[PDB]
Symmetry: D2
Subunit: 330 residues, 4 copies
């Protein structure tokens, strides 16, 4: 008996088209409906009972918080159904890593949730999307996937939705984690080498069923001669937390520290992330006196991931010590 | 006869101190004077005739354009001296990559220029600074380094100052290039495997000797639910170019495109970079219609590198086609 | 109330000495006794109650099966002692990955076992051994290390002894896993990101206490124009299994297949590994008909790791199906 | 207008076929003839005037020295023709890296030579071979390729034939170099970032036009408890040089040193390579006294590359000092 998998389509390159077969990089995203994606991979019927829903049809660089809530809530309804064994979400690659981490935090289900895209449109020579979709459905239909948290199945890899990131442009090996792939998927079969250590899905303190709005969180970049301008402007326009994408170990310019102190006193959470994204993490109290300033370090999380965690966390708490525990457990 | 090498100290972890030998990650930067650094490595006298100058004493996260120009002008004066064969700059790691690329663009000399730092302070157990500085002096004294552009000598590697970046936090292998190390330095000897392809130093059309001050350039991040606020605020407070650190292939939110069109119409250069920094590059006319909008793509350059090239380039031209040529040649 | 950690010294570069501080790569291994190593890191007193035993004093490229067994039996005795909370083994880097996998398979304990070396001798500028040994003792004394299997703590990383390998020559970042580091160790503290998925230590079917001597297993290389000569010679001088370090996916030359069929018919196990060691795995029945020939694939395990597992597996079974199961579970 | 490109087919996965579309890893190699290969990519006619020759039809794991010589001599004949601008060789991936280095050493032409394969057969879902072949023909027709030495064009990359290696099994990003890709190929266009440093093609002292036979060279592996058996057997069966694939920095067991000394006195060249293939190199006189023993180190070259260079080099010299020079220049 085959697993019941639902594919939730959101758009992306995987649903895209280029003018010619040699257009692997210049294309229009989000053109094909979910039923055309499914019919494009007839071998899906060999591995699962598949049906599709069009949740939205967007280029993922323009995704909104409202899109995330709509998708999170539809994933929760499907996961609660006895007729659903696994869920695949087809997604643009640009913000795939943000959606995957979001769902990893707010979906309290051990049913497999797989997020997948492609780096080339389905019209291109050697398009990667067909096999990525096949692999996603294979992983969503595998008992081995239960309880593993949200997964991403590109480039024959099983990556954790927590810490996989789009790290390489153009190439099909775009998605990498500092902590490695957890497995590989080859000819429909899953091979596992690592397990998640961080809190996710069924062991998460967050639940999409209790979230009807997300706090506004924005991101400012650190660099030589940076000023406090972007930090102040983002807060003046409603940011409840600022993710600092610092140089090095979340380092803050002497030009910017005084603004961040004023902003924290005014209730803006200050979360130190970095643009040093291949490995390591940001250490509390090392580059800045986080205890004295009541700031938070983002640990290993890149700025756009730290934004996702901060927004979900701030649905429940504004206690900077609780936010720091969250950044250490998820 | 030994080469004459001048060490220009600017501060950094390499000049830093922690409370104990176990403090490899929690330290105070820019505590030690250049004569103490040099005395810390008595083996330097075996490979070169070294002297030191204290140009500044900063944590590199707080570097300014004024600091870049002071260093750049001092490097120029020493490069013009018949008494100088090579130059080493000791620098904090957080913005080392920005200074190294700046010097690569504006120093019209074939004399070796090496930028070096340490990931651990010199007080730490297994501190990396001593052998990194030894290696920097060895490479700056090597005839094989002439004409290779600015080099970075950490982790026993010879990296190009153009495209090396701080990519891994905490670990001594922090500095990586998408295009690989060009060589290694072991037991004072240099071993080469690749040469630079891009324009630098003697073949650059730019010269520090004509630059009195640099154009203001700022960087805004792209992520889910990003708005145009940072972009507009940075331009309102003097930015002559904005580096867009986009998702994926320099992608721009539909919420942000109209602001960037209006800023370009009002004379602000719009340069599409990305936070996808491990490999690939941003392709002109793929994610956005750069020709229609008169925008520029940053090619493979990460945001902070793209800011440095934009500043130097804009001392010569306001023509977006010329800027694009420069982003494809340097 | 500090953990009791025993350091078992076996030699290596970490116990080595070079002629001068600039000799990071040219040195004599296995010169310093364990008490000098310990006394070289006085900070060890802050984190554990440490004592040293000299098990052997070798360059690890010359390790024998007799040496492995001697170390494995002494590790078992110490693990069984109420007075020992954790075990550190100082080792040459060349075969560290072999010893670490061996102990992971045969030590039926959840007490931390850490194997550590250095890429530079302790006489070198910026020697890595001091912080590597401090980190090893910190990890061996950490409650988070219990039940995680054998760990390798170099370059500030917590690597699984199963699949970490010496992958980079010269540099301190020598040890890598295809499946990523599991964690990091910074300023004595362990930060975890992944858990092991494969069988080890307390959940292993193997136990050093029943092993009197290991079976002879040898390795032969695959390359253009390779012949059957090495395979036949190693079997003629005692090999009970042959690890084939094939090109690609364990591929075998048409000039070698007949010899390996004859060797299997005569009772020699044939295990297909590869020299493609940065990622992926060898797939059963893909490049060769393993079912028809009664051969075994080594999965993701490199040749020298596959040898270790074959030796341990063959103390229990001669059944090629059971050997394949073992290659898929460990 | 268009370049004249000749495709020399040798077999491999790129010419392979599997049972179904989801057979990406289980296929039969070397099934499709060159004229079907070319007809499978109708877009080639947009970028070049292409014609095909079937040079051989083999699984590359079974390649012989006679095969290399036949291919090398055909390439020379086509290079010398005014009607050929560029050459593409379709090849199995298992020994692609060996053929690419061989042609880099012996083809004294500045005309582009590109070697290309695929990791999935052309019958498979999301097969990589079509775009790989398009890119190879694009690179072979590009003026930027002239004088760059032999290139390998997989995974959107331009890799040097010298030091690209099959490093990852299964995945399309299989081919990696320690020293980085030199460029990328995207939508038919070549983007360069590095140049070669080592001797090749027109600056090679070697020429296929003067080579009618290749000395027999074989490879033995180093590991724990290794003996001299494989070394002695390989030399007894005609090896004129032995590539030692050592642990670490080409290290040799104390149980193998005396055999290698006796073999060197008997005229067998001893070349120390390693199975440490992700970075670094084997340093002369470090792990063994190469001057005293008259041995050679393979520098950064992996064992199968070192075999190719030794075979070519020993067409000209058996002076160990000249061979070492060649291992330091090529």
């Amino acid at each position: 008996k085959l697993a019941n998998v639902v594919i939730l389509a959101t758009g992306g390159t995987i649903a895209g088209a280029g003018a010619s077969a040699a257009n692997s990089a210049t294309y229009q995203a989000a053109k094909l409906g979910v039923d055309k994606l499914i019919a494009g991979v007839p071998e899906l019927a060999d591995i699962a009972n598949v049906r599709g829903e069009q949740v939205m049809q967007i280029a993922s660089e323009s995704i909104s918080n409202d899109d995330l809530l709509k998708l999170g809530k539809r994933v929760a309804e499907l996961a609660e159904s006895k007729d659903v064994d696994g869920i695949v979400i087809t997604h643009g690659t640009d913000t795939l890593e943000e959606t995957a981490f979001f769902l990893n935090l707010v979906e309290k289900t051990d049913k497999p949730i797989v997020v997948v895209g492609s780096m080339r449109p389905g019209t291109a020579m050697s398009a990667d999307g067909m096999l990525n979709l096949y692999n996603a459905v294979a992983v969503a239909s595998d008992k081995q996937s239960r309880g593993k948290g949200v997964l991403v199945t590109m480039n024959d890899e099983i990556q954790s939705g927590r810490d996989v990131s789009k790290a390489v442009n153009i190439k099909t090996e775009a998605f990498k984690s500092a902590w490695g792939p957890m497995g590989m998927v080859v000819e429909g079969k899953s091979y596992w080498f690592r397990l998640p250590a961080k809190r996710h899905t069924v062991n998460s303190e967050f639940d999409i069923k209790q979230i009807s709005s997300l706090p506004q969180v924005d991101i400012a970049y650190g660099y030589g001669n940076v000023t406090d301008t972007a930090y102040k402007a983002l807060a003046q326009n409603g940011a409840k937390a600022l993710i600092h994408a610092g140089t090095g170990n979340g380092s803050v310019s002497s030009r910017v520290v005084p603004a961040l102190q004023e902003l924290r006193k005014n209730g803006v959470q200050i979360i130190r992330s970095s643009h040093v994204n291949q490995g390591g993490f940001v250490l509390r109290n090392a580059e800045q006196p986080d205890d004295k300033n009541d700031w938070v370090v983002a640990h290993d999380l890149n700025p756009q991931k730290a934004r996702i965690l901060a927004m979900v966390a701030m649905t429940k708490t504004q206690d900077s010590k609780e936010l720091q525990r969250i950044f250490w457990e998820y």
